[PDB]
Amino acid sequence: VPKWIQLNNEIMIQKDGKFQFDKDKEAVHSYFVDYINQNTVFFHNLKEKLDYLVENQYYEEEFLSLYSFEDIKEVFKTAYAKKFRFPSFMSAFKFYNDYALKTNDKKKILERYEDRISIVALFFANGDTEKAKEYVNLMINQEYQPSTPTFLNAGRKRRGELVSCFLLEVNDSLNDISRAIDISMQLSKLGGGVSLNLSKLRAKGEAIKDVENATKGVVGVMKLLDNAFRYADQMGQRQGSGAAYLNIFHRDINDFLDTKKISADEDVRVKTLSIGVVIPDKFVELAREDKAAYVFYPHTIYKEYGQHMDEMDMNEMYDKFVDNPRVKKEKINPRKLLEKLAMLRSESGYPYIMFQDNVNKVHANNHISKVKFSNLCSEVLQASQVSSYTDYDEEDEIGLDISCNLGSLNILNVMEHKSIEKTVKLATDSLTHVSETTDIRNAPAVRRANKAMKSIGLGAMNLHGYLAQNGIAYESPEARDFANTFFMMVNFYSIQRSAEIAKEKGETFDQYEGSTYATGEYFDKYVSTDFSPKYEKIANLFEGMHIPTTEDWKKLKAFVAEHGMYHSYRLCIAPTGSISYVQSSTASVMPIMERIEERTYGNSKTYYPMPGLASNNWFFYKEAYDMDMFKVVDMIATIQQHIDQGISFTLFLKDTMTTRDLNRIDLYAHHRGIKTIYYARTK
Amino acid sequence: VPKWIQLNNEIMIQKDGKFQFDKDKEAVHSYFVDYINQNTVFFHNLKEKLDYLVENQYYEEEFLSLYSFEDIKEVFKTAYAKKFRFPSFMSAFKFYNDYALKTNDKKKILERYEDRISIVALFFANGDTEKAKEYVNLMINQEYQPSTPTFLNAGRKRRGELVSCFLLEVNDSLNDISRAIDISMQLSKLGGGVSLNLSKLRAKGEAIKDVENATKGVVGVMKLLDNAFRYADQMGQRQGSGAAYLNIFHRDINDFLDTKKISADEDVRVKTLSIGVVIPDKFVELAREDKAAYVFYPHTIYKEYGQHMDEMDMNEMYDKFVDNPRVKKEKINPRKLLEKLAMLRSESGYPYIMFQDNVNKVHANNHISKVKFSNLCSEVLQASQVSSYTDYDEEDEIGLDISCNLGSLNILNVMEHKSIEKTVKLATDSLTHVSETTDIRNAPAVRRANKAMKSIGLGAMNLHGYLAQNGIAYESPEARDFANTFFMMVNFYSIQRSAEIAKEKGETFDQYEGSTYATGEYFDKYVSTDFSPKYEKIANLFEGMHIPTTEDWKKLKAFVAEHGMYHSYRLCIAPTGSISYVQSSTASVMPIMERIEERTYGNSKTYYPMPGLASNNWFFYKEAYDMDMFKVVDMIATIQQHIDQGISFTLFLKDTMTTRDLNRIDLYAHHRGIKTIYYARTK
Amino acid sequence: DFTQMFYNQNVKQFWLPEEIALNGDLLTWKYLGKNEQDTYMKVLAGLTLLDTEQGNTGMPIVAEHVDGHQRKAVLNFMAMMENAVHAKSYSNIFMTLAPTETINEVFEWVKQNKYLQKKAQMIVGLYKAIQKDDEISLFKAMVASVYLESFLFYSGFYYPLYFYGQGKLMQSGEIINLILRDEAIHGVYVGLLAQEIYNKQTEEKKAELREFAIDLLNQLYENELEYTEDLYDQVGLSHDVKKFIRYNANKALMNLGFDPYFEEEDINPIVLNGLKATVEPLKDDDFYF
Amino acid sequence: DFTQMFYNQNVKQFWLPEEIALNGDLLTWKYLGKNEQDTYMKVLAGLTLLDTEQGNTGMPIVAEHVDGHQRKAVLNFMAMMENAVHAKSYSNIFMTLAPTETINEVFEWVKQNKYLQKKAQMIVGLYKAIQKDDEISLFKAMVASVYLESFLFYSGFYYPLYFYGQGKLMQSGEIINLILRDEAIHGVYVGLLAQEIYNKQTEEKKAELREFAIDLLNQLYENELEYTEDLYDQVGLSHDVKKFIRYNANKALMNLGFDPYFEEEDINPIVLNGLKATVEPLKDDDFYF
Numbered sequence A, B: 001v002p003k004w005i006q007l008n009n010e011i012m013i014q015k016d017g018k019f020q021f022d023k024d025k026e027a028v029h030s031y032f033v034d035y036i037n038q039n040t041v042f043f044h045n046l047k048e049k050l051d052y053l054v055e056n057q058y059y060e061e062e063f064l065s066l067y068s069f070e071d072i073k074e075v076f077k078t079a080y081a082k083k084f085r086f087p088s089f090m091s092a093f094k095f096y097n098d099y100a101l102k103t104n105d106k107k108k109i110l111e112r113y114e115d116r117i118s119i120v121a122l123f124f125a126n127g128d129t130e131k132a133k134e135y136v137n138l139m140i141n142q143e144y145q146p147s148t149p150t151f152l153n154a155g156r157k158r159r160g161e162l163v164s165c166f167l168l169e170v171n172d173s174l175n176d177i178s179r180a181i182d183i184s185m186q187l188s189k190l191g192g193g194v195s196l197n198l199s200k201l202r203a204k205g206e207a208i209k210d211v212e213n214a215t216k217g218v219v220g221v222m223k224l225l226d227n228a229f230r231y232a233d234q235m236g237q238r239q240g241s242g243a244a245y246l247n248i249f250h251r252d253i254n255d256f257l258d259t260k261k262i263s264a265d266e267d268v269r270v271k272t273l274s275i276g277v278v279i280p281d282k283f284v285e286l287a288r289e290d291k292a293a294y295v296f297y298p299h300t301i302y303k304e305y306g307q308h309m310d311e312m313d314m315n316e317m318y319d320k321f322v323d324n325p326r327v328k329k330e331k332i333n334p335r336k337l338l339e340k341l342a343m344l345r346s347e348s349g350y351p352y353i354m355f356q357d358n359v360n361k362v363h364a365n366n367h368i369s370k371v372k373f374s375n376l377c378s379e380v381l382q383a384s385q386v387s388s389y390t391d392y393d394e395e396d397e398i399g400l401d402i403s404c405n406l407g408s409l410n411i412l413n414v415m416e417h418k419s420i421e422k423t424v425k426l427a428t429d430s431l432t433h434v435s436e437t438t439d440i441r442n443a444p445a446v447r448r449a450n451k452a453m454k455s456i457g458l459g460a461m462n463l464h465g466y467l468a469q470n471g472i473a474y475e476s477p478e479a480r481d482f483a484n485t486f487f488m489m490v491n492f493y494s495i496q497r498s499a500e501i502a503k504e505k506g507e508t509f510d511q512y513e514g515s516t517y518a519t520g521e522y523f524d525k526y527v528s529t530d531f532s533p534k535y536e537k538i539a540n541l542f543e544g545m546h547i548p549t550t551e552d553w554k555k556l557k558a559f560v561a562e563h564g565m566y567h568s569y570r571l572c573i574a575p576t577g578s579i580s581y582v583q584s585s586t587a588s589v590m591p592i593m594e595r596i597e598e599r600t601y602g603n604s605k606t607y608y609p610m611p612g613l614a615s616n617n618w619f620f621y622k623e624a625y626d627m628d629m630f631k632v633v634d635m636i637a638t639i640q641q642h643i644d645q646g647i648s649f650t651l652f653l654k655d656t657m658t659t660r661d662l663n664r665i666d667l668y669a670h671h672r673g674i675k676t677i678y679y680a681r682t683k
Numbered sequence C, D: 001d002f003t004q005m006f007y008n009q010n011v012k013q014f015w016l017p018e019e020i021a022l023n024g025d026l027l028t029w030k031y032l033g034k035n036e037q038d039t040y041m042k043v044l045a046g047l048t049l050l051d052t053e054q055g056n057t058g059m060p061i062v063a064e065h066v067d068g069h070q071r072k073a074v075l076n077f078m079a080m081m082e083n084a085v086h087a088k089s090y091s092n093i094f095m096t097l098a099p100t101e102t103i104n105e106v107f108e109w110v111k112q113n114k115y116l117q118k119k120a121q122m123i124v125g126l127y128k129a130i131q132k133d134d135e136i137s138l139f140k141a142m143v144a145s146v147y148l149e150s151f152l153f154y155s156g157f158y159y160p161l162y163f164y165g166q167g168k169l170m171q172s173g174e175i176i177n178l179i180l181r182d183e184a185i186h187g188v189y190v191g192l193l194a195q196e197i198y199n200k201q202t203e204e205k206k207a208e209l210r211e212f213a214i215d216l217l218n219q220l221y222e223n224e225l226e227y228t229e230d231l232y233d234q235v236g237l238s239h240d241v242k243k244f245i246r247y248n249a250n251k252a253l254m255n256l257g258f259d260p261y262f263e264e265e266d267i268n269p270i271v272l273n274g275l276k277a278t279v280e281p282l283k284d285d286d287f288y289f
Ligand SMILES: Cc1cn([C@H]2C[C@H](O)[C@@H](COP(=O)(O)OP(=O)(O)OP(=O)(O)O)O2)c(=O)[nH]c1=O
Pocket: A171, A172, A173, A174, A175, A177, A201, A202, A207, A208, A209, A210, A214, A215, A216, A217, A220, B189, B231, B232, B233, B234, B235
């Protein structure tokens, strides 16, 4: 047995009635001095290291050529001057197993944490030495963490894309379905997760050029996409991950949901394709009144009205669709559909739930389009325009397919350094650079929307870690007060940085003038309502850091109206799965699942206590399954009001609660303004 | 039970020790008089019928506008002047159930046999009244039958394509694989069978741009294509049919064959994808000497030589591949692979066997490319060039994908009319017209090859019917003598008509100058060997008909050298499945499977004696299973020497036949020059 | 060629009565007329009684005489479903809808009923006539079994499916649909075992077995028509039930590899809404001619 | 007083081998000596044979002769487990760990092994000797079945348990523990049915039945000793396994209501270490907060 995992297993050996949490420091120390320093390739000087990495196709020469070697040396000194030490064995293990650069035979270790951070910072700065040092300080202090694609691939030659979330709109044609399959395979080949909207596709039993009952529905396209994602699996190390989204008023909604039933046949069930359901407020209203709802055939609506069903307002056109004889509709029970959704989430965790009117009542770019679906992680909520892929000889009408670059603030380290403003602005700059350097040459709509919208996603993590290490319960009103103030400040500084970038570059995102930022309606609750902490305990947490007031928000509103905004979307809170270990942080803004997390890697068993877990804060680290999901919904809705995109909201369910409890949680989330619900995790 | 169904069922009722074959005339008469004349929409004049058909979106106004109504009336007069009578109930039933035009609700009948033939002839002539009358005489005499797509769809507004066989090359790239899936779905949507060459795709466990062992091989593409064909199911009318071809020296050949095993896993098995194996002479030579053979990874060969493995001559390149250390291979047993092929054909009828060197030793367009694979029916053998489908922004390099137009001479009716020359030339003209009028907007390589090659397929049928009705056994040497003479004449007149068309249009097919037609090497066996019948009985069959001599072939060679050749390919003997009933003919050049065909339509069972079956010729209608497959191979090889493309050669096996017997049949077919083997049908 | 595939489909369809809560059926049951409640009870008892014969005799007797370990396992699984799952499910439906005294009386009535008894005893008679090592008698019993699984149950299934398609008695209708789905696969599987025996016979013996199957079908069908009128005339449904019987008779014949006997008919839309030759090596000299 | 609780226990214990992924045992299997792998394969093959006959013959035949639909449902379920679940699980293990030729060889080895043939001959002979309405022949077969469930399996179970207890072959071991958990309740249940018949007899008849049970146990025991030596001598464990089978023989006797026959011994401590969401309808008040 390895010495470091033997030391790491001494955490669970209870001495004097307490877990030996200090063993993890010894565990990581032994891990380093027995595996990492031995397996680390060391060069005489940094120049030899960089030459070796560039020559052997490990790094990219173009980005390293913008700095003189003295500047690169200064950046590396800045990284190593911090003398960063991993606080736990899991942090270092995850870094050196997932993100640290290794030789071509996966034998030795080329990059330390400081080397990777310095390379990512030099990639971000794009020739600026001082900006590179600022990025080094930001990441070595672990105030900001670039997403897994960016952190893993920044500055590497044989790399995937820095963006891993893509959203595709599929038009109701065979040419568009073929192009969707092709683009899905191309993006899965790049390593990204692809989400597809299947609402515009006509339902099963619709006509294909005046021959009736000819269309196979969205389930045939679902099978096509599932096999396309199985094919493009990148060695199978990380198999192709796709998501399909369907509006709840689509006729194929029941067959769409039946693809996830355990008793589904092999000719229907999809395995590699996650599913999400988009629910307008009309469906919730119909289920609330116990009235008879109707699902519609999309092609009939398109023929009758000239627009797709999901491109229309269901809360204003549902009655017109029902009364229209030329529209084909099927009678359903909305409460039965809700119960089926709850049962499917209990048994499989699917579908993802998107509350469409919750997304679009606060959506800033409804002039471009309404948000019709989310991503594979169920937190990207941006306007999309469907493309019209025509025959080979004809020109294609390229729409807007969503993609944003992810990045997380570490709430604990940002709050410790009293650096919300600087961290948010530097992270915004880094995400803007990642957006600018991304060029997808096989997804035309993704490329066009990346150039036009310039959307970024700046998330946060370690919310529960910060609260538990500060003696605040996750369900407590003080926690929601802190989240309100913190994320209002993050929104303020992200909007300020976007406006400053627009002023400097002299350009805004496409169709900015129609957005709510340009009209000033976005800032109504910010110029009217003060978001300063209401509790003295929370107010001391922000001591030494200026909290923008209503006057500051009015000044920012004037600044945005006079200079514009560079990013259509700025903030989205992703799950942040594996980078949470490296940053020694709790995953996303969701509460922790286990206080001490037990994992098996190969034939070795190791335990990961939550960051900062001890006996003085053991009960503040309440597990997500033991807490009220209504209070978690309250917390996420408090955070969501300052986030322009969505939040990956996992529901943590006990075995005792029925499908009625899951439905009640979903309805309370819809009532409280929750935009999306990610997973129904059951213990 | 219908009266005609009862009358047709009285054939099996044996009266005086003989079948009541005359009951089928009563059966068809009753069928007509009781159902067809009742359900046939009648109009006061032909003008009213034509106006109703064009205005109700049944016909195309474009081709009918090319004639004055007087010319169309005279064409219809010519069709009805023959007073054509269906000899059997099954002929009329098949026509009026598969090809006759019906109302949009499929309740009444708009088209009789004469109306369908007149419309097809008017479409063929393209404005020529005398040519239309000639086509009417050719088809109402049932000397020439256009293929099911052409016969069914010609002159129809809501029609599929007139071509149903397509052959696609798939390049070793994700862009090309996605484009192949798209084109396969587009062509299956049109109702055409699609054949895909998978030999260029790199095998399983190959490197993808420095990531070794990352390719799923040809089986992942096979699953993608199977799901693509299942989705593109011809508007839910007829199941989507596709074929995949792999070289026997491809590394994935065993995985390719395992997709057809009855015990195949659901993640390996393909359902709607037929498989064909391409076998060079090198494999047969290795199996003959029992030397252990090697299957090669195609990407290693492409990297080492810059050419695809299937683009190179395995006879000269096999030793170089084996001796090359940079070419990856694994040992196989060629005899074990042959036994596996025979076992698979016994169990499921798959794969098709294409003898690569038998095709290419007589191929007239080896300069353009070698023939690497066949179609879904194993008779189309043409040169193909793989397309390089690049990224979306870049320009694609369009190659040549095979698609030929099918037509069948009725050997019995052509022989009784003494009109081999006239029928062959008119059929060539009609196939040329179908080729010119075909434009496919989503298969650029198919369209380019149709425009450039101008290849057609003129088949033959009713060989066994003609022989049995003339007192000649199918396995007899006299039958092979007749086949030799008849198909030599067919080849002579097809070459003459092609050269005449080239002279008239002043253009040949693309890259004709490199063909064996241009150099005269094609005509060597025709200017050196006499193909007149060697039997007095056979020579009497051709009485009143000039059999081309050696001097005639020399004159044709001079004419082709002077004026060129319009069609790269002219003759291919397709199975001719359903059009054989309408023509009262035995299917293709194959012998009959059963003397009397027992089939069930709806809830009523039907009986179909072979055309011309009686007491006097009962034993000349020997069933195919009772025949010696070696003699059938001899017959097909006699025909194959005059057919530039292949022949759909079905093996008819008894249950007592072993794997060794099937292998012996395959090896004798290879020895005798058979190009392709279609099916292993076991009784 | 088929037993492992059917094994998979059978075991993945496993279910238990407890999974469906039945009490909510009382909210539609109370609104049915006396004739509707009477027909439902009688149909339910008919299905229960026939399915018990299949669990106690039909499946176990076939499992006993069929050779092959894997076939015996699949057949055992099917027998288990009859006795452990289906029988408990029918009992649960009854106990939910009727008081104990009413259940006892309905079963007394259906036990004495001429048309139910005729078909029950005809089927049981063929199971009792199987002789050791006689594949002809086994085939005849398999035909009887397929007729029960794929045909005789359906005059009964009609009514629960009819309610299920209207939004009435949804919990018991869900149970019936699961049962019916099991009987469908049972019928197909036993059908394949019968075809295996049939295909081993001479042409004269085949013609004789076909005559047996058609004659048996005719006897059962004529009794089904009487059974149908006896139960369904009081609720006005007999015409449509008769179409459903013929449609399912055709499925049973197809399971036995035979042609359909009855012309194709459309079914009530409410009910629809409810619903290796020999491997030999190449020994050289086969490559030379 | 007991069938319903056994019914509930049996159905709640339902499982399939596919629920357990076996590729995790690949390395600990690779690491065993050739002697160890040989003994392991043969041990599981002997178990497969026993379950094959218990499923095909033993449980169905006892089900046929035992009165009461609920008792029959339990016995039918147990029969299904024997051949559709237990016997099949061994093939899942074989197909994971061993190449086809080794699998073919071990099944050939069961056919020719004299101890395995003798024990099958004896047990199946008693099953096939049951006479309708003859409770004594039924008792004798139930004793044989208890001896198969609670005694004979254990010379086989020892080895997977011995490895499981050392942290080796733990996925295969998980399957075996599930099988063992089933057989324990099967042995108790059949034991209770046997006691019912025994308790109906005169004292003189009881004395003869005890003689039968003890004579049969001794005869099976002596054969099992030779079988155990044949399998385990090459891995050095024969004496240890013998202690284990004696321990389990006493449990079989106890399941039959008889006193233990062998003296207590210390068993290898390694072997001892080897041992949907509810649907609730939405209310109107659930939509307001
Ligand atoms: C071709 C084809 C289409 N479809 C479905 C998927 C598409 O969403 C939908 C549109 O197909 P299209 O490619 O748009 O077919 P079309 O343009 O000829 O028909 P239309 O005039 O009605 O637009 O039909 C199938 O389900 N199966 C098929 O084989």
